[PDB]
């Protein structure tokens, strides 16, 4: 909508106060004009028609319970925008400042969030398995990273290309979580998963097996479920990414860690210059070795570390 840029204030899903960029025209809308061609947040009003209505508020204060998921979808989309722009010089998901649209309150008791090819969609959870999923910065950034992948490598969402797609989203989800630097970890979705159980999460990158996901290629899932295990076999690549950043000895293979920033630069370059829609895990290894070579040189610690990490998860 046409109006003037304003700054609202409210509380997110975990009860934290934050400022949000809004737009005023009779109502205050969740429309942030300060980033690209805008960030826009919508109310799906517990139904599944999308996007719903652009979020409108009478006084620019967003402290109602109903407001909380919108506050966080909107704010965390901005954080994710800032990460890609500042860290990778990428302007929005298409690289040309496409408008970022999100809908909250999707359906009833919906225990998921997703990128639908055009926009972000967040359920509220059923209050047992999940609370509203935009409360999780890693979840927001995971999903927005799907848009980045769709516009770049275009990894097909099934079998190994699909598991890479998923791991890419968990990797940048986590790097965005560290960027924001509020309780960062290598787990996924811990802020919104199972409110009555502390200490758990949906997936772990540091030890995927904690939740029964494979952490070596020899344990890959090869059935038909979950698009051929895209959220399962992602653990093999997640573990590799973890090891590249943090180091460790895994099934007796030692990896020298090189830290999060180099992890991000190597995987961003692989994603944007080397991976293709049908890439498999071995091709991912090749893409990551070549990206590290480009960035740090053939004889670098960084290239050897990428090799060690893929060796450790059994991907040659
Ligand atoms: Ca209000
Ligand atoms: Ca965390
Ligand atoms: Ca996390
Ligand atoms: Ca929990
Ligand atoms: Zn995903």
If asked whether residues 134 and 31 sit together in one domain, one would say yes
Q: Which residues pair with 100 in a beta bridge?
A: 39
Helix residue ranges per DSSP H, the chain: 68-88, 137-151, 159-180, 225-229, 234-246, 260-273, 281-296, 301-312
N-terminal to C-terminal alpha carbon distance within the chain: 51
Q: Is 177 annotated as a binding residue?
A: yes
Q: Tell me, yes or no, whether 214 lies in a domain.
A: yes
If asked whether residues 99 and 195 sit together in one domain, one would say no
How far is residue 224's CA from residue 79's CA, in Å, rounded to a whole number?
36
Closest CA to 141 of 165, 111, 167, 174: 174
If asked whether residues 113 and 133 sit together in one domain, one would say yes
If asked whether residues 148 and 206 sit together in one domain, one would say no
Q: Is 194 annotated as a binding residue?
A: yes
Q: Is 183 annotated as a binding residue?
A: yes
Q: Is 193 annotated as a binding residue?
A: yes
DSSP letter string over 153-183?
T---SSHHHHHHHHHHHHHHHHHHHHHHTSS
Q: What order do you get walking across the sheet with 17-25 strand by strand?
A: 56-57, 27-29, 17-25, 4-11, 61-62
If asked whether residues 84 and 20 sit together in one domain, one would say yes
Q: Of the candidates 129, 154, 179, which is a domain's last residue?
A: 154
Q: Is 79 exposed, middle or buried (0-12, 13-18, 19+ CB in 10 A)?
A: middle
> 159-180 and 281-296 helices cross at what angle (nearest 10)?
40
Place of tokens 């999100």: 102
Residue 3 Cα, ligand 3 centroid: separation in angstroms?
36
Residue 267 Cα, ligand 3 centroid: separation in angstroms?
18
Q: Tell me, yes or no, whether 291 lies in a domain.
A: yes
Closest CA to 120 of 71, 77, 65, 166: 77
Q: Which ligand is nearest to the CA of 27?
A: 1
CB distance 151 to 132 below 8 Å: no
Q: Tell me, yes or no, whether 1 lies in a domain.
A: no
Query: What CATH number does the domain containing 307 carry?
Result: 1.10.390.10
Q: Which ligand is nearest to the CA of 58?
A: 1
Q: Is 197 annotated as a binding residue?
A: yes
If asked whether residues 119 and 28 sit together in one domain, one would say yes
If asked whether residues 129 and 184 sit together in one domain, one would say no
Helix residue ranges per DSSP H, 68-223: 68-88, 137-151, 159-180
Type and span of the H or E element at 274: none
Positions annotated as catalytic residues are: 143, 231
If asked whether residues 185 and 290 sit together in one domain, one would say yes
Query: What CATH number does the domain containing 122 carry?
Result: 3.10.170.10
CB distance 181 to 137 below 8 Å: no
Q: Tell me, yes or no, whether 82 lies in a domain.
A: yes
List Cβ neighbours of 84 (8 Å cut-off, separation of 6 or more).
Answer: 90, 91, 92, 93, 148
Residue 34 Cα, ligand 1 centroid: separation in angstroms?
21
If asked whether residues 28 and 149 sit together in one domain, one would say yes
If asked whether residues 293 and 241 sit together in one domain, one would say yes
If asked whether residues 94 and 45 sit together in one domain, one would say yes
Q: Tell me, yes or no, whether 304 lies in a domain.
A: yes
Q: Of the candidates 113, 128, 154, which is a domain's last residue?
A: 154
228: domain range?
155-315
Q: Measured between alpha carbons, how far is residue 105 from residues 7, 15, 77, 217, 275 in Å?
A: 23, 17, 16, 38, 34
Structure tokens at 230: 């895209």
Residue 114 Cα, ligand 5 centroid: separation in angstroms?
7
If asked whether residues 182 and 304 sit together in one domain, one would say yes
Our count of domains for the chain comes to 2
Residue 139: Cβ within 10 Å count:
30
Q: Measured between alpha carbons, how far is residue 233 from residues 127, 156, 175, 226 in Å?
A: 28, 14, 20, 10
Structure tokens at 134: 């935009």
Structure tokens at 181: 């630097």
CB distance 277 to 155 below 8 Å: yes
Residue 70 Cα, ligand 4 centroid: separation in angstroms?
21
């Amino acid at each position: 909508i046409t109006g003037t840029s304003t700054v609202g204030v409210g509380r997110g899903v975990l009860g934290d106060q934050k400022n949000i960029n809004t737009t005023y025209s009779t109502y205050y809308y969740l429309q942030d004009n300060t980033r690209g061609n805008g960030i826009f947040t919508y109310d799906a009003k517990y139904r599944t028609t999308l996007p719903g209505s652009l979020w409108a508020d009478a006084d620019n204060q967003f402290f109602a319970s109903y407001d909380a998921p919108a506050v966080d979808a909107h704010y965390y989309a901005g954080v994710t925008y800032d990460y890609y722009k500042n860290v990778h010089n990428r302007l929005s998901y298409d690289g040309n400042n496409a408008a970022i649209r999100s809908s909250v309150h999707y359906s009833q008791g919906y225990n998921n969030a997703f990128w639908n090819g055009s926009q972000m969609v967040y359920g509220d959870g059923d209050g047992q398995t999940f609370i509203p999923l935009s409360g999780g910065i890693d979840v927001v950034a995971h999903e927005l990273t799907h848009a980045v992948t769709d516009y770049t490598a275009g990894l097909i969402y099934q079998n190994e290309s699909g598991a890479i797609n998923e791991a890419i989203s968990d990797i940048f989800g986590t790097l965005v979580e560290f960027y924001a630097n509020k309780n960062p970890d290598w787990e996924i979705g811990e802020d919104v998963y199972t409110p009555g159980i502390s200490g758990d999460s949906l997936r772990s990158m540091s030890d995927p097996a904690k939740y029964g996901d494979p952490d070596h290629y020899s344990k890959r899932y090869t059935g038909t479920q979950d698009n051929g295990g895209v959220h399962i076999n992602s653990g093999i690549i997640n573990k590799a990414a973890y090891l590249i950043s943090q180091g460790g000895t895994h099934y007796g293979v030692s990896v020298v860690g090189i830290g999060r920033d180099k992890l991000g630069k190597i995987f961003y370059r692989a994603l944007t210059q080397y991976l293709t829609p049908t890439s498999n895990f071995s091709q991912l290894r090749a893409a990551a070795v070549q990206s590290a070579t480009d960035l740090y040189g053939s004889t670098s610690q960084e290239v050897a570390s990428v090799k060690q990490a893929f060796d450790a998860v059994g991907v040659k």
